[PDB]
Design a protein around this ligand. Structure first.
Ligand SMILES: CN(C)c1ccc2c(-c3ccccc3C(=O)O)c3ccc(=[N+](C)C)cc-3oc2c1
Length: 154
């Protein structure tokens, strides 16, 4: 992945979200997200509401076998949670960010590129990663699958 032209620093505006905040492994992540995103969409339907944008996930310590993950959908205000689905916010602050097109299994390429770009520009990372799944992977060709990848800055 080349960062020459498409990598940028973004100022992220926090907006309301419905989230699940839990922990997972890389093996179980796919099943976790299908289950939890389904459930969030059902809780939204459950109030006669829709998401306000594509779903996302936040990650820290992804090397560990088991790592924290927070994932969900941006929503209108006035939405309530239930069970383990909670109201919160999308990230705020600065991030080093790039659009990535391709299968998730090759996304480390953009991570490597962004960490090089961050080093070249003297920025500091918090260690948190933030992915926005602009396309649904079940319904999209892998060579067209869009994810925005952001590394949060310290
Ligand atoms: C852009 N919007 C509208 C969407 C909508 C749905 C998804 C689902 C999903 C939700 C429920 C059931 C199946 C899927 C699927 O498509 O497999 C995603 C599932 C997994 C995922 N990861 C990053 C592993 C990412 C997912 O992103 C999505 C994005």
């Amino acid at each position: 992945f080349e960062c020459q032209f498409v990598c940028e620093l973004k100022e992220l505006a926090p907006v309301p979200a419905l989230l699940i905040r839990t922990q997972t492994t890389m093996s179980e992540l796919g099943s976790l997200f299908e289950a939890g995103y389904h459930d969030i969409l059902q809780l939204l339907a459950g109030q006669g509401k829709s998401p306000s944008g594509p779903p996302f996930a936040r990650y820290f310590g992804m090397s560990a076998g088991t790592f924290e993950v927070e994932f969900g959908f941006p929503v209108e205000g006035g939405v309530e949670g239930s069970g383990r689905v909670v109201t919160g916010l999308t990230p705020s602050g600065k991030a080093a960010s790039s659009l990535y097109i391709g299968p998730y299994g090759e996304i480390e390429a953009v991570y490597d590129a962004l960490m090089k770009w961050v080093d070249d520009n003297g920025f500091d990372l918090s260690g948190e990663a933030y992915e926005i799944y602009l396309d649904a992977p079940a319904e999209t060709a892998p060579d067209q699958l869009r994810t925005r990848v952001s590394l949060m800055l310290h």
